Amino acid sequence: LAVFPEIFIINATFILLIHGVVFSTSKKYDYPPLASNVGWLGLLSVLITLLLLAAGAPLLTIAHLFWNNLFRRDNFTYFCQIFLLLSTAGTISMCFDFFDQERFDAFEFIVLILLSTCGMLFMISAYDLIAMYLAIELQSLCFYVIAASKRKSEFSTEAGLKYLILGAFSSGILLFGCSMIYGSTGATHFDQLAKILTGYEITGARSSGIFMGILFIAVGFLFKITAVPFHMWAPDIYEGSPTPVTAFLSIAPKISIFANILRVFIYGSYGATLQQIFFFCSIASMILGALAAMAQTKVKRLLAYSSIGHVGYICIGFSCGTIEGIQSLLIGIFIYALMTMDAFAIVLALRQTRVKYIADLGALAKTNPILAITFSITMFSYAGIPPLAGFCSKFYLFFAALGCGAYFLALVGVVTSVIGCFYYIRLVKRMFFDTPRTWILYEPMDRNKSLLLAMTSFFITLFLLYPSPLFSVTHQMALSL
Amino acid sequence: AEILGIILPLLLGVAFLVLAERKVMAFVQRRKGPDVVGSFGLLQPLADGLKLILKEPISPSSANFFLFRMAPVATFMLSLVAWAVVPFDYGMVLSDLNIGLLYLFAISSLGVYGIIIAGWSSNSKYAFLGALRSAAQMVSYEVSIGLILITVLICVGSCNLSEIVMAQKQIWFGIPLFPVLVMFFISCLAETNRAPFDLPEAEAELVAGYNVEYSSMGFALFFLGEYANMILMSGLCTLFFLGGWLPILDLPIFKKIPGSIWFSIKVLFFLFLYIWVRAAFPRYRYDQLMGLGWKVFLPLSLAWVVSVSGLLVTFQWL
Amino acid sequence: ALKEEKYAARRTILPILQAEEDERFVSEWKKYLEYEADVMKDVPGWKVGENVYNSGRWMPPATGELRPD
Amino acid sequence: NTDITALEKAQYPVVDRNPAFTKVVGNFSTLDYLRFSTITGISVTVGYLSGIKPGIKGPSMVTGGLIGLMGGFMYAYQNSAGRLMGFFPNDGEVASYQK
Amino acid sequence: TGNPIPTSAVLTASAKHIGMRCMPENVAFLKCKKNDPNPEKCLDKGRDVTRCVLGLLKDLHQKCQKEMDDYVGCMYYYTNEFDLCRKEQEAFEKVCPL
Amino acid sequence: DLIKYFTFSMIIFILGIWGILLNRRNILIMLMSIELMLLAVNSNFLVFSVSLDDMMGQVFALLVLTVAAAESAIGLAIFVITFRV
Amino acid sequence: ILSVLSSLALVSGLMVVRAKNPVHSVLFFILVFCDTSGLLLLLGLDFFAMIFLVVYIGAIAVLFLFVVMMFHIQSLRYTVYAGKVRSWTNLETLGNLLYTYYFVWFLVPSLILLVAMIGAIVLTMHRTTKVKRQDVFRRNAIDFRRTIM
Amino acid sequence: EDLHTVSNWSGTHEVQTRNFNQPENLADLEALVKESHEKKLRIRPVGSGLSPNGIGLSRSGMVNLALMDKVLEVDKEKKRVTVQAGIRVQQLVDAIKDYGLTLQNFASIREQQIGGIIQVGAHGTGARLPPIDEQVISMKLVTPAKGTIELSREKDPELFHLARCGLGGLGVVAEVTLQCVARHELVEHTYVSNLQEIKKNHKKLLSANKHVKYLYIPYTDTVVVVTCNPVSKWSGPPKDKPKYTTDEAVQHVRDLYRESIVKYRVQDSGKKSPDSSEPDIQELSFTELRDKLLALDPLNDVHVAKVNQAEAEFWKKSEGYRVGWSDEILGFDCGGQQWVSESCFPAGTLANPSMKDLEYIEELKKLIEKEAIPAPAPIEQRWTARSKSPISPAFSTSEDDIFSWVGIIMYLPTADPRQRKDITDEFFHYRHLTQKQLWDQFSAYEHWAKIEIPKDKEELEALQARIRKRFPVDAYNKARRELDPNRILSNNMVEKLFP
Amino acid sequence: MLEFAPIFIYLVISLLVSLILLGVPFLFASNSSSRFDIRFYLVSILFLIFDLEVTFFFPWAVSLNKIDLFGFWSMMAFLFILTIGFLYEWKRGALD
Amino acid sequence: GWGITGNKGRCYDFWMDFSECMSHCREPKDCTLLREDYLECLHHSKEFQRRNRIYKEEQRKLRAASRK
Question: How many CB atoms within 10 Å of residue A251?
Answer without folding.
Answer: 23
